[PDB]
Curated annotation (Swiss-Prot):
The N-terminal disordered part (1-160) is phosphorylated by AURKB during the G2-M transition, blocking CGAS liquid phase separation and preventing activation. Phosphorylation at Ser-256 activates the nucleotidyltransferase activity. Dephosphorylation at Ser-256 by PPP6C impairs its ability to bind GTP, thereby inactivating it. Nucleotidyltransferase that catalyzes the formation of cyclic GMP-AMP (2',3'-cGAMP) from ATP and GTP and plays a key role in innate immunity. Catalysis involves both the formation of a 2',5' phosphodiester linkage at the GpA step and the formation of a 3',5' phosphodiester linkage at the ApG step, producing c[G(2',5')pA(3',5')p]. It comes from Homo sapiens (Human). This is Cyclic GMP-AMP synthase. Changing residue 107 to E: Reduced nucleotidyltransferase activity. The enzyme activity is strongly increased by double-stranded DNA (dsDNA), but not by single-stranded DNA or RNA. DNA-binding induces the formation of liquid-like droplets in which CGAS is activated. Liquid-like droplets also create a selective environment that restricts entry of negative regulators, such as TREX1 or BANF1/BAF, allowing sensing of DNA. A number of mechanisms exist to restrict its activity toward self-DNA. Changing residue 152 to A: Slightly decreased interaction with histones H2A and H2B. Changing residue 30 to A: Abolished poly-ADP-ribosylation by PARP1, stimulating interferon production.
């Protein structure tokens, strides 16, 4: 538990170190952003992870899309086709009544390829593989560019029982959050079609930076909880294990989003700030680790917003993999986390 504090001190090294990198990234983003704003398809475009990879950045480009009509993809409660109900500037991407993910991405990558290949004053390169574009700025400054539509409709029905923050952040807060927009990113489910996936990364960001039962948690010396610290330690636990077990790729399917999702559920389970006292760091981390093991072992990790979307289903992550991680995390917990030693 003082070992855990030692780990957190080791991780805290961003202060002004990243501030130059960010400047590099912010410089290339805004130029890109204002070129897209030229295009008819990209009028409403504007801005909207790995705790130990300070040169890798993640940016989402949001695009306002009214009149929107969702159609669920074959009862996979998180993936949808996009339809409409005048004529939108996005009507150039229709493939039938369905909005084409692939076709909007090609134009998007085409236009970005223009602004990088035509402006090589400060050099840039663009690699490609939902994240449609990755850019290399100079030596290993990478930034991931994601396209998302913004919808201001009510959230889809699949989220009705999600975001179970009532006893933690209040029913009032749930109500306000759900009046905010939701987002859709092009991604296909496991087969290829023009399907989109729900994204709530902005709500996630908001509850994390306003995370207490108390409105003044994080704002005075008397109300310092260890919530963010437990999330960081959980993300580091996974990154270290993925790195150490990399020779055989047992853990390639697991990601920080799985650990962030489990963390939010423990917040729901543990709603009082007194359950996250800093003097109980060791115990709060163990509650996080213990719930993650339960997810692994039961093979159930509900998306925090979409409770019938199981991140740990066998269609996404096979059984052997989840059993292998279970065993390694069990070993770490039962030995006071040797992976954190110096
Ligand atoms: Zn706090």
């Amino acid at each position: 538990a003082s070992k855990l504090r030692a780990v957190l001190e080791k991780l805290k090294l961003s202060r002004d170190d990243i501030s130059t990198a960010a400047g590099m990234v912010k410089g290339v983003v805004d130029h890109l952003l204002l070129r897209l704003k030229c295009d008819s398809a990209f009028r409403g475009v504007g801005l909207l992870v790995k705790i130990s990879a300070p040169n890798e950045f993640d940016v989402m480009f949001k695009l306002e899309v009214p009149r929107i009509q969702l159609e669920e993809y074959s009862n996979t409660r998180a993936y949808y086709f996009v339809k409409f109900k005048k004529e939108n500037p996005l009507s150039q991407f229709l493939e039938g009544e369905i909005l084409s993910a692939s076709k909007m991405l090609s134009k998007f990558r085409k236009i970005i390829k223009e602004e990088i290949n035509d402006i090589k004053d400060t050099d840039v390169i663009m690699k490609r593989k939902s994240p449609a574009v990755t850019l290399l700025i100079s030596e290993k400054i990478s930034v991931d560019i994601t396209l998302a539509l913004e919808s201001k409709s009510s959230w889809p029905a699949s989220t009705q029982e999600g975001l179970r923050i009532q006893n933690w952040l209040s029913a009032k807060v749930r109500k306000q959050l759900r009046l905010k927009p939701f987002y859709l990113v092009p991604k296909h489910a496991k087969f290829q079609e023009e399907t989109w996936r729900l994204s709530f990364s902005h709500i996630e960001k908001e509850i994390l930076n306003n995370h207490g039962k108390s409105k003044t948690c994080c704002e005075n010396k008397e109300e310092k909880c260890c919530r963010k610290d437990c999330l960081k330690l959980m993300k580091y636990l996974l990154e270290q294990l993925k790195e150490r077990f990399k020779d055989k790729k047992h853990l390639d399917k697991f990601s920080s989003y799985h650990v962030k999702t489990a963390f939010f559920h423990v917040c729901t389970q543990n709603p009082q700030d007194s359950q996250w006292d800093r003097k109980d760091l060791g115990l709060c981390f163990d509650n996080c680790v213990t719930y993650f093991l339960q997810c692994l072992r039961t093979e159930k990790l509900e998306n925090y917003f979409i409770p019938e979307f199981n991140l740990f289903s066998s269609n996404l992550i096979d059984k052997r993999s989840k059993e292998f991680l279970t065993k390694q995390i069990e070993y770490e917990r039962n030995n006071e986390f040797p992976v954190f030693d110096e």
